[PDB]
């Protein structure tokens, strides 16, 4: 229930060390399905998910040519932004772009995106509803004017509310055995006598998909956040994700604490408690 | 901001390899080459979407291209063949914005089996008839360029040291002197009309020039006649108050 | 399917001053743009108008085009035609989705706008070489645009096609054809005569 398709582009200048490096990756939900690296020896858009391999040679030739056209453009933008900001020829700079679309539980369109960044800062983006632009400064305003004279905004919507959505669905159905799956988290709790009066409880969640999950603690039924530590969701390396919440409790009172795990694969939320 | 092609005209012997250049200073990701025969459609040879990549079009055989930088897109004939005689157009564009296609001036190539069939034109100007003058009060001069091969000519009119366009109409196509013979030499005509008063003024100078593109500097030549190199052959007439 | 551009009519002959309409249709509506060009014999291509898939019409002087992307057709309009508008008119489109970026050209429409000869005075004159007479040319001129110059009917006689000259300074334009030969009998009186 609820899906999305996203493309992420990153171009980095290397004055003196040859032409600029270009990397592109494509995701459906939390699964990466495509790759392209300007420095790799293949010079092909490559598959990173199994379901995408059922597409014929037409798709692969078209996506490769489209991603090579994309690199050349970003390569020109690097020289163009350097000029707008009156920057040195020898410094390394970064250009990034993200575009994609969201769909609800019923696969109907919800939101679209097209954002651009220079040196990790917002440069110019299409607004939330897709009908206008947001420029960060005077250089972005210069870009904004070329784009509106070239009627860019109208091209993107057509793609975000149509093509992006049409393919997202095509990918979800053809790869339904691994994209529409829901792997509930394998959970357990560990204990560590930290010292003379302290004790640490660690609540786990391993092998889950999609990455969306909430891990919270409660002391006597009340959200206990004091002396707790929650880590960022991290990838296992096999398509699944991991995460843990830990709390430091007074020695002898650990059964008053409980861990609550919420995830899409769990019909009912799990409540873990320390049982030796 | 423009597309530049070189050379504009070129004669090759069968077997020669030739490179045609094409540059552009607009940062267009897309660059391409076409070939078009007399009265026929454009056919794509090769193309490219950026420095480091290329693709085959409708007719890639016999041609090779490279795209090491965004500014240039050369075309190579590996071994020239009579069938390659055609007009070659380079065309670039952005792969965004309006996506408008920008064509170069064109390069005219003629591949010959024997370079002894190359002839420059002979030019002559014929003066207005007094019967025309007496009946219309206008006067038409006629320029005639004959015996040239191949069809690599550019004809113009120069009245008093400066080029003219008004009152002028040159044949759009030259005509073969021997239609059933391949490698047949050509003829071309043109007319410049002025008022009878202007023609009857002896200070006026009328000149028809025909720029011819023939053999290059290094091509062999030991025939009994002068080497038919790229040259300007012209003829002239002055106003006459007779 | 595959893109296919078609332009009808293939050829078109009309008198000056008339408002022309040229057609261009395509079978695949998924296009990024559509562009009209002009091309004269032995010369390059000049771009006239460019219409993107978002916009539906463009203007440039007496010329104006309109894009009906959804219906797969574009119409080029030429106001008060002139002889200077005689040329081959080509239309092309670029793809929006196929990922090849290859444009698709139509076969083109051949246009010939004929001048209005108000005071015809058809006649054939004889011009002598300025260098050394005995060499001559025959000049058929001042005939109307409804007259057809027949091409040569002898291997040693050469008859050119008609061409329109325009004396701008005195708002006057005329038709003409040239004839030459090396035959001993040849004479300008019987040079043309159609038959």
């Amino acid at each position: 229930g609820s899906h999305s398709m996203r493309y992420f582009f990153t171009s980095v200048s290397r004055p003196g060390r040859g032409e600029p490096r270009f990397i592109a990756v494509g995701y459906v939900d939390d699964t990466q399905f495509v790759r392209f690296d300007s420095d790799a020896a293949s010079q092909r858009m490559e598959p990173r998910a199994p379901w995408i391999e059922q597409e014929g040679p037409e798709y692969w030739d078209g996506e490769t040519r489209k991603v090579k056209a994309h690199s050349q453009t970003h390569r020109v933008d690097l020289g163009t932004l350097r000029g707008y900001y009156n920057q040195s020829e020898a410094g390394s700079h970064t250009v990034q772009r993200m575009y994609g679309c969201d769909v609800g539980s019923d696969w109907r369109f919800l939101r679209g995106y097209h954002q651009y960044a220079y040196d990790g800062k917002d440069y110019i983006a299409l607004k939330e509803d897709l009908r206008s632009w947001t420029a960060a400064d005077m250089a972005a305003q210069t870009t904004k004017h070329k784009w509106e004279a070239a009627h860019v905004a109208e091209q993107l919507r057509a793609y975000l509310e149509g093509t992006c959505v049409e393919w997202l669905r095509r990918y979800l159905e053809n790869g339904k055995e691994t994209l529409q799956r829901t792997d509930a988290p394998k959970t357990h709790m560990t204990h560590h006598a930290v010292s003379d009066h302290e004790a640490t409880l660690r609540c786990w969640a391993l092998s889950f998909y999609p990455a969306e999950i909430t891990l919270t603690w409660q002391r006597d039924g009340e959200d206990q956040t004091q002396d707790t530590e929650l880590v960022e969701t991290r990838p296992a390396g096999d398509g699944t994700f991991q995460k843990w919440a830990a709390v430091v409790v007074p020695s002898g009172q650990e059964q008053r604490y409980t861990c609550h795990v919420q995830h899409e694969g769990l019909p009912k939320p799990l409540t873990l408690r320390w049982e030796p | 901001m423009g597309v530049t092609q070189t050379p504009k005209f070129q004669v090759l012997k069968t077997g020669q390899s030739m490179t045609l250049q094409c540059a552009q200073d607009m940062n267009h990701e897309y660059m391409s080459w076409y070939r078009q025969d007399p009265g026929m459609g454009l056919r794509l040879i090769h193309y490219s979407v950026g420095a480091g990549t290329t693709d085959q079009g409708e007719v890639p055989n016999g041609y090779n291209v490279s795209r090491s930088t965004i500014e240039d897109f050369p075309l190579r004939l590996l071994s020239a063949a009579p069938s390659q005689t055609s007009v070659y157009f380079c065309a670039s564009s952005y792969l965004g914005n309006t996506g408008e296609l920008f064509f170069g001036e064109g390069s005219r190539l003629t591949v010959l089996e024997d370079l002894k069939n190359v002839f420059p034109p002979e030019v002559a100007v014929f003066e207005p008839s007094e019967a025309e003058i007496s009946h219309t009060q206008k006067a038409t001069l006629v320029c005639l360029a004959t015996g040239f091969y191949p069809d690599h000519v550019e004809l113009s009119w120069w009245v008093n040291g400066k080029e003219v366009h008004s009152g002028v109409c040159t044949d759009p196509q030259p005509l073969k002197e021997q239609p059933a013979l391949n490698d047949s030499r050509y003829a071309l005509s043109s007319r410049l009309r002025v008022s009878a008063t202007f023609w009857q003024d002896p200070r006026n100078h009328f000149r028809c020039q025909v720029q011819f593109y023939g053999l290059s500097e290094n091509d062999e030549w030991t025939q009994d006649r002068a080497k038919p190199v790229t040259q300007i052959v012209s003829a002239e007439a002055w106003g006459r108050a007779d | 399917m595959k893109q296919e551009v078609t332009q009808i009519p293939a050829a078109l002959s009309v008198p000056e001053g008339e408002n022309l309409v040229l057609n261009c249709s395509f079978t695949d509506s998924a296009i990024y743009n559509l562009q009209w060009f002009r091309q004269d014999p032995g010369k390059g291509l000049t771009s006239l108008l460019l219409i993107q898939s978002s916009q539906r019409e463009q203007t440039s002087g007496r010329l104006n085009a309109s894009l009906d992307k959804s219906s797969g057709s574009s119409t080029l309009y030429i106001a008060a035609s002139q002889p200077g508008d005689s040329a081959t008119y080509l239309c092309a489109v670029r793809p929006l989705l196929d990922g090849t970026y290859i444009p698709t050209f139509g076969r083109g429409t051949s246009l010939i706008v004929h001048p209005y000869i108000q005071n015809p005075d058809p006649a054939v004159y004889q011009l002598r070489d300025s260098k050394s007479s005995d060499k001559s040319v025959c000049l058929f001129t001042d005939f109307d645009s409804q007259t057809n110059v027949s091409q040569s009917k002898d291997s040693d006689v050469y008859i050119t096609d008609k061409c329109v000259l325009d004396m701008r300074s005195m708002d006057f334009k005329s038709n003409s054809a040239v004839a030459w030969s090396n035959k001993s009998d040849f004479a300008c009186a019987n040079a043309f005569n159609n038959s």
Binding site: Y7, G26, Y59, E63, K66, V67, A69, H70, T73, V76, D77, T80, L81, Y99, Y116, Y123, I124, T143, K146, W147, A150, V152, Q155, L156, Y159, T163, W167 | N27, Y94, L95, G96, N97, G99 | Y32, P95, L96, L97, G99, Y101
Partner: peptide
């Protein structure tokens, strides 16, 4: 599937 046309900034 990627967007095909991208306008320079």
């Amino acid at each position: 599937s990627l967007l095909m046309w991208i306008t320079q900034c």
